[PDB]
């Protein structure tokens, strides 16, 4: 174990590779962040050096993936979302992602409508597909039938329960909310 | 250069 | 009057220019000295990345407030704000200030981009914040370092760090450079310089200067010797990081 | 077996009733002389 | 969910920090860390942080009370506290919390103006009292008030003298002066959830997601300074004579601190 | 009474959604508000309506303590106000000082409440503004005189609610002690009860 | 917190809770009444009001005629409108509330890609409201549901168009009104009403129309020696 | 927030209901609306409504030291605001070109035109003189500004009082409105201003127009005048190009609307004065 810092050498190219957190000059590597090292080694010999501040290590949410998220923004055309937890480890850099109207749904009928489906201020879980070019922007879909939404709170306060595909009700009072429930 | 303490953020 | 703070009164002088005294002069000491250095990184909480350092009176912060998003065009920027604490100095100035605070921002952004890599940092604004609590002699330098600090904590990527050195110069008949000084070292002297490099690669990255007089050979040997104190200065530096990064490894 | 007891509105109209807005009075828009025919009863 | 997972913590009367709904957290001071200036103070609540720095000079007094030397405070809260701040002019967190000290500074009437005066409609001091949070995670009112009194507390003047025949004042920076305090206003913040769930010292998030605040300044004689209700689900007196016996607690164990300290140099 | 003659007017402006002007004794002031209207995305929060005070005095320009009192209206204001209903959206309170004769805020939220009514906007209860000074020898007086807030030593300045009759805001000026903020702190009750039954007969006589 | 059945025509205040009496019979929460488990809380001042179904298993429904002038988008609503840009295949109008509403470029009758319709910056027009919420942005269109515009569509040309009060409305609309049927026996007219407290009228001559948006503007507290005296200058005109 | 856009429909029938000269409520062309003169209990407040423009006007005094170049005469500062409840687009900080051309037009007006005595306010020349400042806030925006502020102004600065002041060498004593009488101010004439709009590039003209006809107009004529028939400003804005004779008539019914103005204001003052001398703290003038 060492802890590295943004000017010292490491390494020659002849004695490892950068993997990230490097760069190079003459016939050496040098490092580039306050962190830990760490060389691996493939089944060729030539190792990997890489450097890691594992305050925040990395994460990264793949395409067959299953991750929560909160509903801000909605519109008709489709309803923008902060990624919380990927999997179930959380992450305090709150990904942006998006649902869009078609991908809402396995039998991917246009009679779909996002007010039905989902509202501004609810968590659901979904399953993200393209990571985005410029902005990152995440594309959730939930053509699934244990998929969407799993708690959502009333007209003004009140927590409800996934009655049925497409309905939910509060304990309290009684009243038949639409949305994409989950399972 | 040597060293001194903390007179405002003591550690 | 400023209607975003409390009236206090139209003008205000000190009473040291009321002052009647001849005040102490330093007088003799080893021109190739260096003040007892403290520097913490890792201090502040709710910042990503923050540092503190205090050599002699001098008790500087700097907080950075990572990247906030706002090739060659889609490359980073680093905005630094400077500012000295209305209770430093001899003499009080209001918070704003306008004249000064904004030279030596300038400064620390012209030190800090080269050594920032900013290509992998597109599309994004780094906030860098500078606060000088006390001034006791050689201020933008440890404000150079205290940046530089503060970034390699918060985990930006760089090429090396940024080393800052002050000097002075004695008006005396004969005329020798004072290496860093202190705040009376400061105002009883003839010219003043500020080297600031980068010591692995060995490149300067900010410098600055003013004079009473000099000459160019005066001014090359200043260049040098600030470059060997700025040497002498970086391990105490690599050390703070090092231990940081060893309480993190604590915490978790 | 549950159903709601009270709902909320925001619609005068089921609170009220009224009349169709776009009218007319003796000859301009004969058009609209029968939607008043049409939708007023 | 933070909601939810901070309403778990509060029925089991406890915090996710491990403080017992009616403590507050690790309060440290340091006093003359600063040379520049007359008074100094820094003050930090475990992550809170504050630093007051009191400069000391000359003004010319206004004509309704020529015998008034002015104290005139600033909050500052630089974008380093916390990024909810940007790069400019003051918000309105560091306007109502300068409002709130100089509020203070007069109606606790911790010092008497007339004790500033040297020369009445000539000359008359003038305290600069600049105050600098370095880390806003919650409380910052309580910290910035104890900070003030500690360094307001350090101050030590000079002399000044009057020459008629010059008709100028002559500083004697060698002899100098402490500063007379009467009162020593302590403040106790208090969070007001839902209804009647209040929390002493609340941090960030706890005032982030709360319905109310309120602060109240306890004079060391059994009287109170301040009341700063702003907003919040509502009280009724019941909900207010434990904040302000707490009050009076929090007023004992800062004072033996300060006490502690200012002895200890 | 124990308190001063005090009337209001409704709709007295054409151009912004609801108006009142509020005087009691000579302290006039005079309340205009924008309802849901549009907010840029810097200060629009989902779920929630963003309430946004402005007070202006009629001398000089405002400072600090206008800002302070601002957001004391503001918070009140988000206290009683329905704004889960309105999100994505601005409601604005503009307050103007066209008199200053003591008991001000006293008047600021009276008329901001009345203003709010007439702009048909939801809030969950009416809230009220009382002021009541404490002299040297502890006789207090509610609804004071700039006379009476100078002569004494303490001055106290409660927002109520209707409903349950509680504190929803308190701003004073002075020291003063315990006894005495529980005994004006009745007695703003009591007066809070009489500015209700006016709201009532105002509306009532607004609505013929 | 009492007698629903009792301030049916008084003066209700926000805060008051009122309610009702019963297993039960389903009714209704009025737009300016708020539910609060099984009381009735009211957030608006307002001469209070009920109804009930011709039925008797209706129950009944409660309300506030509350005046005021800001609009709310609501569903199933007839609203003027005033185009305030176009964006590719939707042209955005504004109602007069929080947000401007949007329109398609085939909603109107009769459209298609191949027959757009004449819609020009400015233009006003008369729609209504087909998904109107707190949540998102609400869309309109100018035709019945059938796929008729049943006197939807762009307005004309050649009124007037004035604004009033929302109970204005709310009370001129009613079918027992006295001045704008008194109206239609003077000189002829034509014009629309907009719940959204705006109105649009059209007769031949200028001097008509301006008089008669006087009268509707005024019309809520009209004197009688007013009422004749406008009266008396439409017969004059 | 903004303004609501304006309907060509409103556009046009505005732009032909003047071709045929016929106004909105059913005033003609050179004619105001029923302007309201109110005053408040403390000496130096006015709220004048025309029709549904309400302005607010406040008049203050302070004693400082003067400026160098005139340590005789005293100083006067104006200042408006356009309060957010005037209308929506009143933004703080925005809507500066009109809060800059109305504030350099009424300092223009009252002070050049040399309206008060800054001579009068004199106490210690070159110490201390007066510093009077009046205060104007819009609070409704229905149409004619320039025109209300104006009238807000003087009737302010016509219903003030200065607090007493004794002298003798330098000592220099102040006194309370209780401890003697305040003393007004010295006017030598009234000015106020008058607004003309202009339709189709120069081809009609209107007086004091609504908020719609400020917004299908192209041009704006303010003239500034008195009881005596003496030109203190006028101005041309909007971007139009009007001729001489416009100018010359526009004068001619300007001399005859500020007569009648400056009869209405000398009543409100003396009926404030008559209530005041017999218990009261309001004074009220209609048109």
Same mark, same amino acid.
């Given at each position: 174990?060492?802890?590295?810092?943004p000017?010292?050498?490491?390494?020659?190219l002849?004695?490892?590779?950068?993997?990230?957190?490097?760069?190079?000059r003459?016939?050496?590597?040098?490092?580039?962040?306050?962190?830990?090292?760490?060389?691996?080694?493939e089944?060729?010999?030539?190792?990997?050096?890489?450097?890691?501040?594992?305050?925040?290590?990395?994460?990264?949410?793949?395409?067959?993936?299953?991750?929560?998220?909160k509903?801000?923004?909605?519109?008709?055309?489709?309803?923008?979302?902060?990624?919380?937890?990927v999997?179930?480890?959380?992450?305090?850099?709150?990904?942006?992602?998006?649902?869009?109207?078609?991908?809402?749904?396995?039998?991917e009928?246009?009679?779909?409508?996002?007010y039905?489906?989902?509202?501004?201020?609810?968590?659901?879980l979904?399953?993200?597909?393209?990571?985005?070019?410029?902005?990152?922007?995440?594309?959730?879909?939930?053509?699934?039938?244990?998929?969407?939404?799993?708690?959502?709170?009333?007209?003004?306060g009140?927590?409800?329960?996934?009655?049925?595909?497409?309905?939910?009700?509060?304990?309290?009072?009684?009243?038949?909310?639409?949305r994409?429930?989950?399972? | 250069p040597?060293?001194k303490?903390?007179?405002?953020?003591?550690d | 009057?400023?209607?975003?703070?409390?009236?206090?009164?139209?003008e205000?002088?000190?009473?040291?220019?009321?002052?009647?005294?001849?005040?102490?002069?330093?007088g003799?000491?080893?021109?190739?000295?260096?003040?007892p250095?403290?520097?913490?990184?890792?201090?502040?909480?709710?910042?990503?990345?923050?540092?503190?350092?205090?050599?002699?009176?001098?008790?500087?912060?700097?907080?950075?407030?990572?990247?906030?998003?706002?090739?060659?065009?889609?490359?980073?920027?680093?905005?630094?704000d400077?500012?000295?604490?209305?209770?430093?100095?001899?003499?009080?100035?209001?918070?704003?200030?306008?004249?000064?605070?904004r030279?030596?921002?300038?400064?620390?952004?012209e030190?800090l981009?080269?050594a920032?890599?900013?290509?992998?940092?597109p599309?994004?604004?780094?906030?860098?914040?500078?606060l000088?609590?006390?001034?006791?002699?050689?201020?933008?330098?440890?404000?150079?370092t205290?940046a530089?600090?503060?970034?390699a904590?918060?985990?930006?990527?760089?090429?090396?760090?940024?080393?800052?050195?002050?000097?002075?110069?004695?008006?005396?008949?004969a005329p020798?450079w004072?290496?860093?000084?202190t705040?009376?070292?400061?105002?009883?002297?003839?010219?003043?310089?500020?080297?600031?490099?980068?010591?692995?690669?060995?490149?300067?990255?900010?410098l600055?200067?003013?004079?009473?007089?000099?000459?160019?050979?005066?001014?090359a040997?200043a260049?040098r010797?600030?470059?060997?104190?700025?040497?002498?200065?970086y391990?105490?530096?690599?050390?703070?990081?090092?231990?940081?990064?060893?309480?993190?490894?604590?915490?978790? | 077996?549950?159903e709601?007891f009270?709902?909320?509105?925001?619609?005068?109209?089921?609170?009220?009733?009224?009349?169709?807005?776009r009218?007319?009075?003796?000859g301009?828009?004969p058009?609209?002389?029968?939607?008043?025919?049409?939708?007023?009863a | 969910?933070?909601?939810?997972?901070?309403?778990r913590?509060?029925?089991?009367?406890?915090?996710?920090?491990?403080?017992?709904?009616?403590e507050?957290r690790?309060?440290?001071?340091?006093?003359?860390?600063i040379?520049?200036?007359?008074?100094?103070?820094?003050?930090?609540?475990?992550?809170?942080?504050?630093?007051?720095?009191?400069?000391?000079?000359?003004?010319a007094?206004?004509?309704?009370?020529?015998?008034?030397?002015?104290?005139?405070?600033?909050?500052?809260?630089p974008?380093?506290?916390?990024?909810?701040?940007?790069?400019?002019?003051?918000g309105?967190?560091?306007?109502?919390?300068?409002?709130?000290?100089?509020?203070?500074?007069?109606?606790?009437q911790?010092?008497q103006?007339?004790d500033?005066?040297?020369?009445?409609?000539?000359?008359?001091?003038?305290?600069?009292?600049?105050?600098?949070?370095?880390?806003?995670?919650?409380?910052?009112?309580?910290?910035?008030?104890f900070?003030?009194?500690?360094?307001?507390?350090n101050?030590?003047?000079?002399?000044?003298?009057?020459?008629?025949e010059?008709?100028?004042?002559?500083?004697?920076?060698?002899?100098?002066?402490?500063?007379?305090?009467?009162?020593?206003?302590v403040?106790?913040?208090?969070?007001?959830?839902?209804?009647?769930?209040?929390?002493?010292?609340?941090?960030?998030?706890?005032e982030?997601?709360?319905?109310?605040?309120?602060?109240?300044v306890?004079?060391?004689?059994?009287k109170?300074?301040?009341?700063?209700?702003?907003?919040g689900?509502?009280?009724?007196?019941?909900?207010?004579?434990?904040?302000?016996?707490?009050?009076?607690?929090?007023?004992?164990?800062?004072?033996?601190?300060?006490?502690?300290?200012?002895?200890?140099? | 009474?124990?308190?001063?003659?005090?009337?209001?007017?409704?709709?007295?402006?054409?151009?912004?959604?609801?108006?009142?002007?509020?005087?009691?004794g000579?302290?006039?002031?005079?309340?205009?508000?924008?309802?849901?209207?549009?907010?840029?995305?810097?200060?629009?929060?989902?779920?929630?309506?963003?309430?946004?005070?402005?007070?202006?005095?009629?001398?000089?320009?405002?400072?600090?303590?206008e800002?302070?009192?601002?957001?004391?209206?503001?918070?009140?204001?988000?206290?009683?106000?329905?704004?889960?209903?309105?999100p994505?959206?601005?409601?604005?309170?503009?307050?103007?000082?066209?008199?200053?004769?003591?008991?001000?805020?006293?008047?600021?939220?009276?008329?901001?409440?009345?203003?709010?009514?007439?702009a048909?906007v939801?809030?969950?209860?009416?809230?009220?503004?009382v002021?009541?000074?404490?002299?040297?020898?502890?006789t207090?007086?509610?609804?004071?005189?700039?006379?009476?807030?100078?002569?004494?030593?303490a001055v106290?300045?409660?927002?109520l609610?209707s409903?349950?009759?509680?504190?929803?805001?308190?701003?004073?000026?002075?020291?003063?002690?315990?006894?005495?903020?529980?005994?004006?702190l009745?007695?703003?009750?009591?007066?809070?009860?009489?500015?209700?039954?006016?709201?009532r007969?105002?509306?009532?006589?607004?609505?013929? | 917190?009492?007698?629903?059945?009792?301030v049916?025509?008084?003066?209700?205040?926000?805060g008051?809770?009122?309610?009702?009496?019963?297993?039960r019979?389903?009714?209704?929460?009025?737009?300016?009444?708020?539910?609060?488990?099984?009381?009735?809380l009211?957030?608006k001042?307002?001469?209070?009001?009920?109804?009930?179904?011709?039925?008797?298993?209706?129950?009944?429904?409660?309300?506030?005629?509350?005046?005021?002038?800001?609009?709310?988008?609501?569903?199933?609503?007839?609203?003027?409108?005033?185009?305030?840009?176009?964006?590719?295949?939707?042209?955005?109008?504004?109602?007069?509330?929080?947000?401007?509403?949007?329109?398609?470029?085939?909603?109107?009758e009769?459209?298609?890609?191949?027959?757009?319709?004449?819609?020009?910056?400015?233009?006003?027009?008369?729609?209504?409201?087909?998904?109107?919420?707190?949540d998102?942005?609400?869309e309109?269109?100018?035709?019945?549901?059938?796929?008729?515009?049943?006197?939807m569509?762009v307005?004309?040309?050649?009124?007037?168009?004035?604004?009033?009060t929302?109970?204005?409305?709310?009370?001129?609309?009613?079918?027992?009104?006295?001045?704008?049927?008194?109206?239609?026996?003077?000189?002829?007219?034509?014009?629309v009403?907009?719940?959204?407290?705006?109105?649009?009228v059209?007769?031949?001559?200028?001097?008509?129309?301006?008089?008669?948006?006087?009268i509707?503007?005024?019309?809520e507290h009209?004197?009688?020696?007013?009422?004749?005296?406008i009266?008396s200058?439409?017969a004059?005109? | 927030?903004?303004?609501?856009?304006?309907?060509?429909?409103?556009?046009?029938?505005?732009?032909?209901?003047?071709?045929?000269?016929?106004?909105?409520?059913?005033?003609?062309?050179?004619?105001?609306?029923?302007?309201?003169?109110?005053?408040?209990?403390?000496?130096?407040?006015?709220?004048?409504?025309?029709?549904?423009?309400r302005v607010?006007?406040?008049?203050?005094?302070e004693?400082?030291?003067?400026?160098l170049?005139?340590?005789?005469?005293?100083?006067?500062?104006?200042?408006?605001?356009?309060?957010?409840?005037?209308?929506?687009a009143?933004?703080?900080?925005r809507?500066?070109?009109?809060?800059?051309?109305?504030?350099?037009?009424?300092?223009?007006c009252?002070?050049?035109?040399?309206?008060?005595?800054?001579?009068?306010?004199?106490?210690?020349?070159?110490?201390?003189?007066?510093?009077?400042?009046?205060?104007?806030?819009?609070?409704?925006?229905?149409? $004619?500004?320039?025109?209300?502020?104006?009238?807000?102004?003087?009737?302010?600065?016509?219903?003030?009082?200065?607090?007493?002041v004794?002298?003798?060498g330098?000592?220099?004593?102040?006194?309370?409105?209780?401890?003697?009488?305040?003393?007004?101010?010295?006017?030598?004439?009234?000015?106020?201003?008058?607004?003309?709009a202009?339709?189709?590039?120069?081809?009609y003209?209107?007086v004091?127009? $609504?908020?719609?006809?400020?917004?299908?107009?192209?041009?704006?004529?303010?003239?500034?005048?008195?009881?005596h028939?003496?030109?203190?400003?006028?101005?041309?804005?909007?971007?139009?190009?009007?001729?001489?004779?416009?100018?010359?008539?526009?004068?001619?019914?300007?001399?005859?609307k500020?007569?009648?103005?400056?009869?209405?204001?000398?009543?409100?003052?003396?009926?404030?004065?008559?209530?005041?001398?017999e218990?009261?703290?309001?004074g009220?003038?209609?048109?």
């Amino acid at each position: 174990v060492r802890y590295c810092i943004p000017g010292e050498r490491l390494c020659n190219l002849e004695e490892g590779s950068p993997g990230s957190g490097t760069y190079t000059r003459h016939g050496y590597i040098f490092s580039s962040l306050a962190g830990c090292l760490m060389k691996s080694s493939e089944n060729g010999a030539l190792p990997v050096v890489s450097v890691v501040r594992e305050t925040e290590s990395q994460l990264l949410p793949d395409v067959g993936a299953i991750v929560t998220c909160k509903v801000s923004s909605i519109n008709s055309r489709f309803a923008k979302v902060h990624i919380l937890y990927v999997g179930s480890m959380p992450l305090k850099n709150s990904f942006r992602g998006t649902i869009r109207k078609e991908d809402v749904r396995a039998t991917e009928k246009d009679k779909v409508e996002i007010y039905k489906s989902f509202r501004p201020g609810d968590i659901v879980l979904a399953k993200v597909i393209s990571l985005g070019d410029a902005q990152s922007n995440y594309l959730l879909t939930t053509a699934e039938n244990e998929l969407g939404v799993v708690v959502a709170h009333s007209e003004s306060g009140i927590q409800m329960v996934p009655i049925s595909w497409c309905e939910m009700q509060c304990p309290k009072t009684h009243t038949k909310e639409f949305r994409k429930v989950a399972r | 250069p040597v060293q001194k303490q903390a007179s405002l953020f003591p550690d | 009057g400023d209607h975003r703070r409390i009236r206090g009164p139209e003008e205000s002088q000190p009473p040291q220019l009321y002052a009647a005294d001849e005040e102490e002069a330093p007088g003799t000491r080893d021109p190739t000295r260096l003040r007892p250095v403290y520097a913490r990184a890792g201090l502040l909480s709710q910042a990503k990345g923050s540092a503190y350092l205090e050599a002699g009176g001098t008790k500087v912060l700097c907080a950075v407030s990572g990247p906030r998003q706002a090739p060659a065009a889609l490359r980073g920027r680093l905005l630094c704000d400077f500012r000295r604490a209305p209770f430093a100095g001899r003499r009080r100035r209001a918070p704003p200030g306008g004249c000064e605070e904004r030279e030596l921002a300038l400064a620390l952004q012209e030190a800090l981009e080269p050594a920032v890599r900013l290509g992998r940092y597109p599309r994004a604004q780094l906030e860098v914040s500078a606060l000088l609590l006390e001034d006791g002699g050689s201020a933008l330098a440890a404000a150079l370092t205290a940046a530089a600090l503060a970034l390699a904590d918060a985990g930006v990527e760089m090429y090396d760090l940024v080393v800052g050195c002050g000097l002075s110069l004695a008006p005396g008949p004969a005329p020798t450079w004072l290496l860093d000084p202190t705040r009376l070292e400061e105002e009883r002297a003839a010219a003043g310089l500020t080297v600031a490099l980068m010591p692995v690669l060995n490149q300067v990255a900010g410098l600055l200067g003013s004079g009473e007089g000099g000459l160019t050979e005066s001014w090359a040997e200043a260049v040098r010797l600030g470059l060997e104190g700025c040497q002498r200065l970086y391990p105490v530096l690599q050390q703070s990081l090092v231990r940081a990064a060893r309480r993190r490894g604590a915490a978790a | 077996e549950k159903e709601s007891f009270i709902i909320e509105e925001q619609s005068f109209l089921l609170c009220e009733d009224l009349l169709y807005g776009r009218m007319s009075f003796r000859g301009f828009n004969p058009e609209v002389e029968k939607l008043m025919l049409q939708m007023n009863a | 969910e933070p909601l939810e997972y901070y309403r778990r913590f509060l029925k089991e009367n406890c915090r996710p920090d491990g403080r017992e709904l009616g403590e507050f957290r690790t309060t440290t001071v340091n006093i003359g860390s600063i040379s520049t200036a007359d008074g100094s103070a820094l003050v930090k609540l475990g992550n809170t942080t504050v630093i007051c720095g009191v400069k000391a000079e000359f003004a010319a007094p206004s004509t309704d009370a020529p015998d008034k030397g002015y104290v005139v405070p600033n909050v500052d809260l630089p974008p380093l506290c916390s990024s909810r701040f940007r790069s400019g002019p003051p918000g309105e967190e560091a306007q109502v919390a300068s409002q709130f000290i100089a509020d203070v500074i007069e109606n606790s009437q911790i010092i008497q103006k007339e004790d500033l005066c040297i020369s009445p409609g000539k000359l008359v001091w003038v305290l600069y009292c600049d105050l600098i949070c370095l880390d806003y995670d919650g409380n910052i009112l309580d910290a910035c008030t104890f900070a003030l009194l500690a360094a307001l507390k350090n101050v030590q003047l000079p002399e000044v003298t009057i020459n008629e025949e010059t008709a100028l004042a002559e500083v004697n920076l060698k002899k100098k002066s402490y500063l007379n305090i009467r009162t020593h206003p302590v403040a106790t913040s208090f969070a007001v959830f839902d209804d009647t769930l209040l929390i002493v010292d609340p941090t960030g998030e706890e005032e982030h997601l709360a319905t109310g605040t309120l602060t109240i300044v306890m004079d060391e004689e059994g009287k109170l300074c301040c009341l700063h209700k702003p907003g919040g689900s509502g009280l009724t007196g019941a909900k207010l004579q434990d904040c302000m016996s707490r009050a009076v607690t929090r007023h004992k164990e800062v004072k033996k601190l300060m006490d502690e300290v200012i002895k200890s140099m | 009474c124990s308190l001063r003659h005090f009337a209001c007017e409704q709709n007295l402006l054409s151009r912004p959604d609801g108006s009142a002007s509020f005087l009691q004794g000579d302290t006039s002031v005079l309340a205009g508000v924008y309802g849901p209207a549009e907010v840029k995305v810097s200060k629009e929060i989902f779920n929630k309506a963003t309430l946004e005070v402005i007070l202006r005095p009629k001398i000089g320009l405002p400072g600090v303590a206008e800002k302070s009192r601002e957001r004391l209206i503001r918070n009140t204001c988000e206290a009683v106000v329905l704004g889960t209903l309105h999100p994505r959206t601005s409601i604005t309170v503009v307050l103007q000082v066209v008199s200053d004769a003591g008991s001000l805020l006293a008047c600021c939220l009276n008329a901001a409440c009345m203003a709010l009514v007439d702009a048909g906007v939801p809030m969950r209860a009416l809230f009220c503004g009382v002021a009541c000074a404490l002299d040297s020898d502890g006789t207090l007086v509610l609804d004071p005189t700039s006379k009476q807030e100078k002569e004494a030593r303490a001055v106290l300045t409660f927002a109520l609610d209707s409903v349950e009759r509680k504190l929803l805001m308190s701003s004073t000026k002075g020291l003063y002690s315990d006894t005495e903020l529980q005994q004006c702190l009745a007695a703003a009750q009591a007066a809070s009860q009489h500015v209700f039954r006016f709201y009532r007969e105002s509306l009532q006589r607004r609505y013929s | 917190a009492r007698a629903a059945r009792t301030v049916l025509g008084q003066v209700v205040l926000p805060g008051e809770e009122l309610l009702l009496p019963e297993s039960r019979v389903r009714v209704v929460c009025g737009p300016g009444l708020r539910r609060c488990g099984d009381r009735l809380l009211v957030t608006k001042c307002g001469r209070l009001r009920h109804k009930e179904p011709g039925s008797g298993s209706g129950g009944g429904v409660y309300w506030v005629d509350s005046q005021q002038k800001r609009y709310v988008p609501v569903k199933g609503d007839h609203v003027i409108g005033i185009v305030t840009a176009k964006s590719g295949d939707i042209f955005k109008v504004d109602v007069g509330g929080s947000e401007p509403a949007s329109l398609s470029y085939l909603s109107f009758e009769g459209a298609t890609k191949r027959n757009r319709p004449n819609v020009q910056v400015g233009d006003l027009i008369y729609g209504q409201f087909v998904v109107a919420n707190k949540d998102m942005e609400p869309e309109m269109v100018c035709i019945d549901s059938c796929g008729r515009a049943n006197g939807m569509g762009v307005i004309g040309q050649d009124g007037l168009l004035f604004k009033v009060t929302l109970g204005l409305i709310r009370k001129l609309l009613a079918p027992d009104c006295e001045i704008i049927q008194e109206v239609g026996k003077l000189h002829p007219l034509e014009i629309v009403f907009g719940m959204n407290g705006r109105i649009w009228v059209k007769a031949k001559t200028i001097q008509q129309t301006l008089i008669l948006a006087n009268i509707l503007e005024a019309c809520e507290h009209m004197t009688s020696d007013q009422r004749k005296q406008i009266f008396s200058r439409l017969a004059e005109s | 927030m903004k303004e609501t856009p304006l309907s060509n429909c409103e556009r046009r029938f505005l732009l032909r209901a003047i071709e045929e000269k016929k106004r909105l409520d059913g005033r003609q062309t050179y004619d105001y609306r029923n302007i309201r003169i109110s005053f408040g209990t403390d000496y130096g407040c006015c709220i004048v409504e025309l029709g549904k423009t309400r302005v607010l006007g406040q008049v203050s005094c302070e004693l400082v030291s003067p400026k160098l170049n005139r340590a005789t005469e005293g100083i006067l500062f104006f200042n408006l605001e356009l309060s957010q409840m005037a209308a929506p687009a009143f933004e703080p900080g925005r809507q500066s070109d009109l809060l800059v051309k109305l504030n350099r037009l009424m300092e223009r007006c009252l002070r050049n035109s040399k309206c008060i005595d800054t001579e009068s306010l004199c106490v210690v020349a070159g110490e201390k003189v007066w510093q009077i400042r009046v205060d104007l806030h819009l609070l409704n925006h229905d149409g $004619n500004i320039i025109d209300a502020a104006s009238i807000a102004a003087i009737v302010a600065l016509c219903h003030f009082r200065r607090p007493d002041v004794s002298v003798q060498g330098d000592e220099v004593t102040l006194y309370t409105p209780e401890e003697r009488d305040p003393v007004p101010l010295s006017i030598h004439h009234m000015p106020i201003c008058v607004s003309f709009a202009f339709f189709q590039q120069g081809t009609y003209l209107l007086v004091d127009p $609504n908020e719609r006809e400020e917004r299908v107009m192209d041009g704006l004529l303010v003239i500034a005048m008195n009881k005596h028939r003496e030109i203190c400003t006028i101005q041309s804005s909007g971007g139009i190009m009007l001729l001489k004779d416009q100018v010359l008539r526009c004068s001619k019914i300007a001399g005859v609307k500020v007569a009648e103005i400056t009869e209405l204001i000398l009543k409100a003052l003396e009926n404030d004065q008559k209530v005041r001398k017999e218990g009261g703290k309001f004074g009220f003038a209609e048109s």
